[PDB]
Scaffold this active site. Structure first.
Site, PDB file in Angstrom:
ATOM      1  N   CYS A  30       0.816  -1.214   0.000  1.00 11.97           N
ATOM      2  CA  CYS A  30       0.000   0.000   0.000  1.00 11.97           C
ATOM      3  C   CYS A  30       0.854   1.270   0.000  1.00 11.97           C
ATOM      4  O   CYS A  30       1.680   1.460   0.898  1.00 11.97           O
ATOM      5  CB  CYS A  30      -0.927   0.008   1.220  1.00 11.97           C
ATOM      6  SG  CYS A  30      -1.954   1.486   1.357  1.00 11.97           S
ATOM      7  N   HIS A 106      -4.278  -8.005  -4.075  1.00 11.19           N
ATOM      8  CA  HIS A 106      -4.975  -8.576  -5.202  1.00 11.19           C
ATOM      9  C   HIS A 106      -4.193  -8.402  -6.498  1.00 11.19           C
ATOM     10  O   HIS A 106      -3.197  -7.646  -6.567  1.00 11.19           O
ATOM     11  CB  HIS A 106      -6.365  -7.948  -5.324  1.00 11.19           C
ATOM     12  CG  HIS A 106      -6.342  -6.458  -5.464  1.00 11.19           C
ATOM     13  ND1 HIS A 106      -6.077  -5.829  -6.661  1.00 11.19           N
ATOM     14  CD2 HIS A 106      -6.538  -5.475  -4.556  1.00 11.19           C
ATOM     15  CE1 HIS A 106      -6.113  -4.520  -6.484  1.00 11.19           C
ATOM     16  NE2 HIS A 106      -6.393  -4.279  -5.217  1.00 11.19           N
ATOM     17  N   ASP A 107      -4.668  -9.125  -7.512  1.00  6.45           N
ATOM     18  CA  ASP A 107      -4.126  -9.073  -8.858  1.00  6.45           C
ATOM     19  C   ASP A 107      -4.499  -7.763  -9.552  1.00  6.45           C
ATOM     20  O   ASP A 107      -5.333  -6.994  -9.057  1.00  6.45           O
ATOM     21  CB  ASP A 107      -4.616 -10.284  -9.667  1.00  6.45           C
ATOM     22  CG  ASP A 107      -4.082 -11.605  -9.127  1.00  6.45           C
ATOM     23  OD1 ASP A 107      -3.052 -11.598  -8.414  1.00  6.45           O
ATOM     24  OD2 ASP A 107      -4.688 -12.656  -9.426  1.00  6.45           O
ATOM     25  N   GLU A 184      -9.937   1.271  -3.783  1.00  8.67           N
ATOM     26  CA  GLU A 184      -8.632   1.917  -3.941  1.00  8.67           C
ATOM     27  C   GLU A 184      -8.643   3.000  -5.035  1.00  8.67           C
ATOM     28  O   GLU A 184      -7.963   4.020  -4.906  1.00  8.67           O
ATOM     29  CB  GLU A 184      -7.529   0.870  -4.159  1.00  8.67           C
ATOM     30  CG  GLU A 184      -7.196   0.105  -2.876  1.00  8.67           C
ATOM     31  CD  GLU A 184      -6.745  -1.334  -3.095  1.00  8.67           C
ATOM     32  OE1 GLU A 184      -6.565  -1.757  -4.257  1.00  8.67           O
ATOM     33  OE2 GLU A 184      -6.567  -2.045  -2.084  1.00  8.67           O
TER      34      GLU A 184
HETATM   35  C1  HEM Z   1      -5.335   0.667   7.482  1.00  7.79           C
HETATM   36  C2  HEM Z   1      -5.804   1.025   6.281  1.00  7.79           C
HETATM   37  C3  HEM Z   1      -5.289   0.410   4.952  1.00  7.79           C
HETATM   38  C4  HEM Z   1      -4.847  -0.841   4.717  1.00  7.79           C
HETATM   39  C5  HEM Z   1      -4.726  -2.009   5.722  1.00  7.79           C
HETATM   40  C6  HEM Z   1      -4.484  -0.934   3.313  1.00  7.79           C
HETATM   41  C7  HEM Z   1      -3.988  -2.049   2.660  1.00  7.79           C
HETATM   42  C8  HEM Z   1      -3.706  -2.148   1.311  1.00  7.79           C
HETATM   43  C9  HEM Z   1      -3.304  -3.348   0.596  1.00  7.79           C
HETATM   44  C10 HEM Z   1      -3.129  -4.738   1.245  1.00  7.79           C
HETATM   45  C11 HEM Z   1      -3.128  -3.036  -0.702  1.00  7.79           C
HETATM   46  C12 HEM Z   1      -2.679  -3.983  -1.860  1.00  7.79           C
HETATM   47  C13 HEM Z   1      -3.763  -4.289  -2.899  1.00  7.79           C
HETATM   48  C14 HEM Z   1      -3.155  -4.511  -4.277  1.00  7.79           C
HETATM   49  O1  HEM Z   1      -2.993  -3.479  -4.977  1.00  7.79           O
HETATM   50  O2  HEM Z   1      -2.832  -5.671  -4.698  1.00  7.79           O
HETATM   51  C15 HEM Z   1      -3.404  -1.618  -0.839  1.00  7.79           C
HETATM   52  C16 HEM Z   1      -3.333  -0.900  -2.011  1.00  7.79           C
HETATM   53  C17 HEM Z   1      -3.612   0.433  -2.179  1.00  7.79           C
HETATM   54  N1  HEM Z   1      -3.838   1.365  -1.163  1.00  7.79           N
HETATM   55 FE1  HEM Z   1      -4.192   0.851   0.828  1.00  7.79          FE
HETATM   56  N2  HEM Z   1      -4.725   0.294   2.729  1.00  7.79           N
HETATM   57  C18 HEM Z   1      -5.223   1.141   3.699  1.00  7.79           C
HETATM   58  C19 HEM Z   1      -5.591   2.455   3.509  1.00  7.79           C
HETATM   59  C20 HEM Z   1      -5.419   3.215   2.373  1.00  7.79           C
HETATM   60  C21 HEM Z   1      -5.826   4.596   2.191  1.00  7.79           C
HETATM   61  C22 HEM Z   1      -6.545   5.445   3.266  1.00  7.79           C
HETATM   62  C23 HEM Z   1      -5.480   4.974   0.951  1.00  7.79           C
HETATM   63  C24 HEM Z   1      -5.676   6.352   0.268  1.00  7.79           C
HETATM   64  C25 HEM Z   1      -6.600   7.249   0.641  1.00  7.79           C
HETATM   65  C26 HEM Z   1      -4.841   3.834   0.316  1.00  7.79           C
HETATM   66  C27 HEM Z   1      -4.342   3.780  -0.960  1.00  7.79           C
HETATM   67  C28 HEM Z   1      -4.091   2.629  -1.681  1.00  7.79           C
HETATM   68  C29 HEM Z   1      -4.036   2.555  -3.124  1.00  7.79           C
HETATM   69  C30 HEM Z   1      -4.261   3.709  -4.115  1.00  7.79           C
HETATM   70  C31 HEM Z   1      -3.721   1.096  -3.457  1.00  7.79           C
HETATM   71  C32 HEM Z   1      -3.562   0.481  -4.862  1.00  7.79           C
HETATM   72  C33 HEM Z   1      -2.082   0.324  -5.192  1.00  7.79           C
HETATM   73  C34 HEM Z   1      -1.923  -0.252  -6.576  1.00  7.79           C
HETATM   74  O3  HEM Z   1      -2.929  -0.748  -7.158  1.00  7.79           O
HETATM   75  O4  HEM Z   1      -0.781  -0.213  -7.101  1.00  7.79           O
HETATM   76  N3  HEM Z   1      -4.818   2.783   1.206  1.00  7.79           N
HETATM   77  N4  HEM Z   1      -3.755  -1.109   0.401  1.00  7.79           N
HETATM   78 MN   LIG Z   2      -1.741  -6.510  -6.045  1.00  8.95          MN
END
Ligand code: HEM
Ligand SMILES: [Mn+2]
Ligand SMILES: *[C@@H]1O[C@H](CO)[C@@H](O[C@@H]2O[C@H](CO)[C@@H](O[C@@H]3O[C@H](CO)[C@@H](O)[C@H](O)[C@@H]3O)[C@H](O)[C@H]2NC(C)=O)[C@H](O)[C@H]1NC(C)=O
Ligand SMILES: *[C@@H]1O[C@H](CO)[C@@H](O[C@@H]2O[C@H](CO)[C@@H](O)[C@H](O)[C@H]2NC(C)=O)[C@H](O)[C@H]1NC(C)=O
Ligand SMILES: *[C@H]1O[C@H](CO)[C@@H](O)[C@H](O)[C@@H]1O[C@H]1O[C@H](CO)[C@@H](O)[C@H](O)[C@@H]1O
Ligand SMILES: *[C@@H]1O[C@H](CO)[C@@H](O)[C@H](O)[C@H]1NC(C)=O
Ligand SMILES: *[C@H]1O[C@H](CO)[C@@H](O)[C@H](O)[C@@H]1O
Ligand SMILES: *[C@H]1O[C@H](CO)[C@@H](O)[C@H](O)[C@@H]1O
Ligand SMILES: *[C@H]1O[C@H](CO)[C@@H](O)[C@H](O)[C@@H]1O
Ligand SMILES: *[C@H]1O[C@H](CO)[C@@H](O)[C@H](O)[C@@H]1O
Ligand SMILES: *[C@H]1O[C@H](CO)[C@@H](O)[C@H](O)[C@@H]1O
Ligand SMILES: *[C@H]1O[C@H](CO)[C@@H](O)[C@H](O)[C@@H]1O
Ligand SMILES: *[C@H]1O[C@H](CO)[C@@H](O)[C@H](O)[C@@H]1O
Ligand SMILES: *[C@H]1O[C@H](CO)[C@@H](O)[C@H](O)[C@@H]1O
Ligand SMILES: *[C@H]1O[C@H](CO)[C@@H](O)[C@H](O)[C@@H]1O
Ligand SMILES: *[C@H]1O[C@H](CO)[C@@H](O)[C@H](O)[C@@H]1O
Length: 299
Positions: A30, A106-107, A184
């Site tokens: 993330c 995820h994928d 996301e």
């Molecule tokens: C405790 C809260 C959070 C957890 C546990 C978490 C966890 C994760 C995880 C496991 C992924 C990987 C999914 C993947 O792309 O395969 C991810 C991706 C992502 N996260 Fe978080 N997230 C949290 C909060 C946030 C917040 C608040 C934002 C922005 C406001 C954010 C932005 C993103 C974005 C944009 C991705 C996509 C990355 C990509 O596709 O390359 N996340 N997150």
């Molecule tokens: Mn992924």
């Protein structure tokens, strides 16, 4: 940034500097959690993280309200129990475990390779956790020559990513994940949509330079005029954006899309795993940090 720099003022009055992760530090798949950990808003070593630590970090330093991360917190701790084999209580063991494939991770990610992307053998796996410039470029190329993008553009990006992943992943691996990814997608609109435009709440437009800075650097694009959204973004904004992305009309359809790719997505819900299910081995790669250029404390 350094507390005295005033770079966050008056939106964030208590900043801490960027510090690159070391070889033993734990980082996530993330970009948000990685940015927070790089600033020490959550532990810099990426270990032993409580819900309140996360809530306060997102609210006070990213303009993201508690409502936005309610499900994300639930799922983080479900994955923690699944990976480690025991209840993690209110201390997330580390950030790295969040890269457990076909779970929260995820994928067809925007900026990460898939767990079995381009592997010659069935049992092999790769780094599905660290920022990957090549992968992110495949996302950016969909909006090449632009400064901003809208819901329809985001929909095209995720479709392109789905198409590429379905083609490149080891046969049988690819699993579509519209509900998680487009939360996301909503997250991206929540954080880096252009709040300086008069109609930001009706048709938010992502600033590409802001997005690129955040993802590549895993720090905050203050130098580009970004600041935490004020008031803090709420879950309603996020899920509306998510729905709007998937509802947007597709003007260019990629080949090799999985069934039902175009159209609305299911509501994201708590994850669950069978007790008999052994977790996939986590990629062991050292945490990524930006090197071209490397970042200073105020970057
Ligand atoms: C405790 C809260 C959070 C957890 C546990 C978490 C966890 C994760 C995880 C496991 C992924 C990987 C999914 C993947 O792309 O395969 C991810 C991706 C992502 N996260 Fe978080 N997230 C949290 C909060 C946030 C917040 C608040 C934002 C922005 C406001 C954010 C932005 C993103 C974005 C944009 C991705 C996509 C990355 C990509 O596709 O390359 N996340 N997150
Ligand atoms: Mn992924
Ligand atoms: C973040 O936490 C996770 C979860 O604890 C860590 O992944 C796990 O790391 C341990 C090593 O400390 C692995 O245990 C080893 O398993 C192998 C094979 O079963 C065995 O030969 C060894 O004796 C040892 O028990 C475990 O496999 C691994 N879990 C998974 C699913 O990959 C991870 O290393 C932590 N990351 C960071 C950077 O702190
Ligand atoms: C990652 O962060 C670095 C450091 O802030 C960015 O490099 C700076 O870009 C700004 C543009 O506003 C310039 O003012 C500085 O001259 C640059 N500094 C250096 C040392 O190059 C970099 O652009 C960021 N990466 C991305 C992709 O946004
Ligand atoms: C993670 O470490 C494992 C050994 O502990 C290897 O089996 C994996 O291939 C993976 O190695 C990668 O990351 C480590 C950093 O811990 C590097 O030392 C390797 O060069 C490799 O990139
Ligand atoms: C930062 O401090 C200024 C000056 O006291 C204040 O007006 C502002 O509300 C503060 N910002 C936050 C988010 O508390
Ligand atoms: C983002 O949120 C919307 C509304 O809940 C879903 O339809 C979509 O699948 C994604 O989870
Ligand atoms: C996003 O979607 C959720 C349900 O998934 C709503 O509660 C919210 O109002 C927004 O439409
Ligand atoms: C839900 O909220 C989003 C973001 O404010 C809007 O763009 C959308 O039209 C819907 O009202
Ligand atoms: C989810 O929400 C969006 C924005 O309100 C709609 O465009 C979509 O039809 C779905 O109801
Ligand atoms: C959505 O709208 C576009 C026009 O921009 C069409 O190309 C598409 O068929 C769908 O109706
Ligand atoms: C239709 O418009 C979209 C923008 O939403 C492009 O990505 C596509 O190439 C086509 O021109
Ligand atoms: C590409 O083709 C699909 C159908 O396969 C359409 O839904 C889309 O609008 C685009 O024209
Ligand atoms: C329209 O856009 C899609 C998705 O970006 C491409 O896959 C297609 O080749 C065309 O350029
Ligand atoms: C959540 O749901 C799964 C089924 O997918 C169960 O295996 C688990 O015990 C929990 O109830
Ligand atoms: C990252 O580290 C390099 C040294 O390799 C510096 O040139 C740069 O200022 C940043 O601190």
């Amino acid at each position: 940034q350094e507390p005295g720099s005033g770079i966050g003022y008056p939106y964030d009055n208590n900043t801490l500097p960027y510090v690159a992760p070391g070889p033993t530090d734990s980082r996530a798949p993330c970009p948000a959690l990685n940015a927070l950990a790089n600033h020490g808003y959550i532990p810099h070593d990426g270990r032993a993280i409580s819900r309140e630590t996360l809530q306060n970090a997102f609210l006070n330093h990213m303009g993201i309200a508690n409502s936005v991360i309610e499900l994300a917190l639930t799922n983080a701790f479900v994955v923690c129990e699944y990976v480690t084999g025991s209840d993690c209580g209110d201390s997330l063991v580390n950030l790295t475990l969040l890269a457990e494939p076909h779970a929260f991770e995820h994928d067809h990610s925007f900026s990460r390779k898939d767990y079995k992307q381009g592997v010659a053998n069935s049992n092999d796996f790769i780094d599905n956790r660290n920022f990957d410039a090549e992968t992110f470029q495949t996302s950016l190329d969909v909006v090449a020559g632009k400064t901003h993008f809208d819901y329809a553009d985001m929909n095209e990006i995720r479709l392109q990513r789905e198409s590429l992943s379905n083609e490149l992943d080891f046969p049988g691996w690819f699993t579509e994940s519209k509900p998680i990814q487009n939360v996301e997608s909503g997250f991206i609109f929540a954080l880096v949509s252009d709040f300086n435009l008069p109609d930001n709440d009706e048709n938010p437009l992502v600033r590409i330079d802001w997005w690129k800075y955040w993802f590549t650097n895993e720090s905050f694009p203050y130098h580009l005029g970004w600041h935490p959204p004020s008031p803090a973004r709420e879950i309603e904004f996020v899920t509306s954006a998510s729905s709007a992305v998937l509802a947007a009309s597709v003007t260019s359809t990629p080949s090799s899309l999985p069934s039902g790719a175009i159209g609305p997505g299911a509501e994201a819900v708590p994850l669950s795993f069978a007790s008999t299910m052994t977790p996939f081995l986590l990629a062991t790669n050292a945490p990524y940090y930006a090197q071209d250029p490397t970042l200073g404390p105020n970057d």
